[PDB]
Ligand binder design. Structure first.
Ligand SMILES: C[Si]1(C)C[Si](C)(C)c2cc(C3(c4ccc(C(=O)O)cc4)OCCO3)ccc21
Ligand SMILES: C[Si]1(C)C[Si](C)(C)c2cc(C3(c4ccc(C(=O)O)cc4)OCCO3)ccc21
Lengths: 11, 215, 215, 10
């Protein structure tokens, strides 16, 4: 479920 | 300029300012995806949208958003593009790699038409913000708020063009009318990327690979 | 509005006012290619272009031009499209024929949006006229000539918008922003037709077949 | 493109 994009959208 | 100030969109644009040609462009694409998130975050009211909606908007727009970026960055160079890595990719270099048709489409339809009208960074950001706030995106929980945020961007953009360039009344419409071309180029660009992956003849980094995998 | 009158564009729109579901839609698509030529001629200054450029524009635009025409025709119908052949095609007929995805896109991104802003027949005409004068079309003898004509159409459109809808300031830009939807749907629409031709279990008429052949 | 040319001429 696309990890990297979510992690970067936090901070 | 109230809810969508052109100064903040310009600040987002200025805050992100940076052997096998196909390998090099791909390295640069993965690189730019990271800094595209940082850009999106700095766009007024984007960060306030739910996380799942934010994901959809980037997954739907990344191609167009990044294509507009490297194009405007290339108005300076004569026959090619300046990659964010610092390398230059010339027409001939791209043709020799069997991607001449699409590279030419970028040059004549975007870079040239940007250069011709001397599109500024504010106008660049606004168009990119309009692309980002795409209410047609499948899955959007609240598409009306994304629809309203787009209207906020282009009301600001027209205001700016009337203010900054009163001499050219058709300039606002001129900017909007590069978006179908940007859309068209974006899709054809997506195709190529899928093919490189399918064949696997080309190294594709983790972020790029992630954006190329089904919803 | 004296060099590109909105009244004449509207006259051009009024002059052409009209068992497998996929087969029926294709038959209409052929019928509509003939009358598309008649429409194009009645658009100011189109006929004055060299014959070779008249061909290029129509080969590049027939998809988006025809899609825009039937979408607007289908605002009155509830959950499907009004074909020019008189038949009403419901979204379930479409889905149960395997083309449910692209059909829904037309309903959502085009028909819905046309209904919700009550896009009139003059605005349709102008948008179609903008699409027709596509300067990006490869092969065009004089691209700047086509570029000039595009500018006259949208200038006359904004003048129509600011005049007959003074309460809605963002309508002109709202109109122009259905064009990337139109372009995106246009290409996926073309991708299907090629497949129907390739597999060859859908009768395709001569004019439709001629439009579907490599440049 | 036979048909198109014929249709655009007249
Ligand atoms: C098929 Si291609 C080898 C010919 Si192409 C139209 C030049 C191109 C552009 C992309 C890129 C991209 C490129 C460069 C940057 C950068 O700023 O450095 C950012 C993104 O745009 C969409 C996604 O990635 C990727 C691949 C290819
Ligand atoms: C893949 Si499809 C079976 C799903 Si569809 C998006 C509904 C569609 C539309 C087309 C049409 C077309 C044009 C005009 C009419 C008309 O009746 O006026 C009807 C269809 O648009 C582009 C070319 O021809 C053709 C095929 C398909």
């Amino acid at each position: 479920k696309h990890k990297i994009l979510h992690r970067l959208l936090q901070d | 300029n109230e809810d969508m100030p052109v100064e903040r969109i310009l600040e987002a644009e200025l805050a992100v300012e940076p052997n096998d040609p196909v390998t090099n462009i791909c390295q640069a694409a993965d690189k730019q995806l990271f800094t595209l998130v940082e850009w999106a975050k700095r766009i007024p009211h984007f960060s306030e949208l739910p996380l799942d909606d934010q994901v959809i908007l980037l997954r739907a727009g990344w191609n167009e958003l990044l294509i507009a970026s490297f194009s405007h960055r290339s108005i300076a160079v004569k026959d090619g593009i300046l990659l964010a890595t610092g390398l230059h990719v010339h027409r001939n270099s791209a043709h020799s790699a069997g991607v001449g048709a699409i590279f030419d489409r970028v040059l004549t339809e975007l870079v040239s038409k940007m250069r011709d009208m001397q599109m500024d960074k504010t106008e660049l950001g606004c168009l990119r913000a309009i692309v980002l706030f795409n209410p047609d995106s499948k899955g959007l929980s609240n598409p009306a708020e994304v629809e309203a945020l787009r209207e906020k961007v282009y009301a600001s953009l027209e205001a700016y063009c009337k203010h900054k360039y009163p001499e050219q009344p058709g300039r606002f419409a001129k900017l909007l009318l590069r978006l179908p071309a940007l859309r068209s180029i974006g899709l054809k660009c997506l195709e190529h990327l899928f093919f490189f992956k399918l064949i696997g003849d080309t190294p594709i980094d983790t972020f790029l690979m992630e954006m190329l995998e089904a919803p």
